[PDB]
Amino acid sequence: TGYDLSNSVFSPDGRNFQVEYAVKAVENGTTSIGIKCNDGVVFAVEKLITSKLLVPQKNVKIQVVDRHIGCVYSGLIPDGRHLVNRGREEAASFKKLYKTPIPIPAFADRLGQYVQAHTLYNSVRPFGVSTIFGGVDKNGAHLYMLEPSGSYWGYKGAATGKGRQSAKAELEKLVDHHPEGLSAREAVKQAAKIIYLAHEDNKEKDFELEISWCSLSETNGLHKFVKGDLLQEAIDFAQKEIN
């Protein structure tokens, strides 16, 4: 052994243990999710209130890339910020040469290739985040989830972090109960509920809900934060279902 002491080393069963250990940091993070709706995507995340002294609404976690893409992650927050900074550079350079804003699948591979690059050498460490991201491009809505290995796929709904199992089952019900699809507004409400449900595995502390969305009809295909009345209404709808 000693195969797990250095990144990019294959174990005798063909595994990269440092990547698997990165996944442990992800599983240790707060719960974050995304829901692909009819003409858009919704992102939501649980923010643990470690103390009264945290200024409410003020430690924003969901991040915009370009103007049409939202990103949320669980695990090591700084790693996620590093990945989004890179994503912002990739989006800028794509738009600079090709004019059109980067399509979501194209953007997914940019993040994927970069994250995968950090599994090729022992001089770097893998990313300790799983990232849920997406938005609207010329072919419609797209939701993706990307892991520390560089692995990503497109999703109907996605979840990561500590309450991932609970969120998944919730997400599966929605897929079954709505083959035609979910409206963006329905998706916001559902996202609030699912984060409330998943917060059981994290019940020690209270939390603060944070939601965002990009919808062709509701935001003109731009990424926006769900604030004020529409946020409250989703918090209320969530409170009801956990009661």
Add this chain to the structure above:
Amino acid sequence: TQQPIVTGTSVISMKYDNGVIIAADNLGSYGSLLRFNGVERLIPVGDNTVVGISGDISDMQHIERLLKDLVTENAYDNPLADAEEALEPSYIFEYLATVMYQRRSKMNPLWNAIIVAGVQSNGDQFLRYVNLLGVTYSSPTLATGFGAHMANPLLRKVVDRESDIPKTTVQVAEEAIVNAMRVLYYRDARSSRNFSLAIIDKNTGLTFKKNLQVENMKWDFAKDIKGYGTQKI
């Protein structure tokens, strides 16, 4: 070092009691060939700023992309991007001025003259100029190119000094601006009849007018002009 190829002529502007006005025609010339006839040279940034650009059009299109990218970037990790941490006219200007001077210092200028017109958070009018050399200045009226020679004299009769600004209504200022545009159309060989005009008012926000035309033109007196001295017929 280069040379301008496709070019835009004057940008003109002035302050009035509640804001600023800026105007520029819609032509892109190719030397003396009036090549392109629907070029927008006023580029709004948010709802408080309009950047008007003359000179090389390829460089204008580059600057326009820089400004668009500025807006994208300012919104990053910025919950107050549409409130207290929106871009101000003064931020946009200082950035452009930095870029212009840097480019001149590398002997590779952006071949333009630029006027940034807007209204600050506190309601203050903003009007300032920068060009390919990195030279900057402010005045109650500003104009580039021919506009500096013909528009400024007219605009300065309305606002001649700082104390004239609060006495100048948006109606008087706009009419002054529109007249100056007619005069430039008479006398500038690289001007066009079609122009855009933007008003940034601290109360009514940004009004952006496209497809304006020079009208009320005096040509009738030309019928009486014969020869170049002695000819009667």
